[PDB]
């Protein structure tokens, strides 16, 4: 039975999503880096769960 982990830390997308967050000062740094995260479907305005 194929089962999927719902833990945020055991998530294939956690690394990227951690980078693409308003938390990360690299995103604050470049008002332009916030766009690339949004373009690759990972909006930092949204929470980690979103």
């Amino acid at each position: 039975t194929i089962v999927v982990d719902e833990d945020v830390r055991k998530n294939k997308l956690k690394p990227v999503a951690t980078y693409c967050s308003a938390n990360n000062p690299e995103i604050s740094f470049k008002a332009m880096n916030e766009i690339q995260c949004r373009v690759n479907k990972i909006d930092p305005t949204k929470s980690l769960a979103e």
Binding site: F29, K30, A31, M32
Partner: protein, 50 residues
């Protein structure tokens, strides 16, 4: 690229306060600046604000 359509005359308003404000918004710290120069002699910043 060099043109603005439906613009015919530029008149001066000699208003330093707005000028400063615009120079600030447009040149000194734009939100989406022109691309950085990437090279050995360059640190990597894109704007004076940064």
């Amino acid at each position: 690229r060099l043109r603005i359509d439906d613009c015919f005359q530029i008149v001066g308003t000699g208003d330093f306060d707005t000028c400063q404000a615009q120079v600030e918004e447009l040149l000194v710290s734009p939100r989406f600046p022109l691309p950085a120069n990437i090279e050995a002699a360059s640190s990597g910043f894109e704007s004076v604000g940064q």
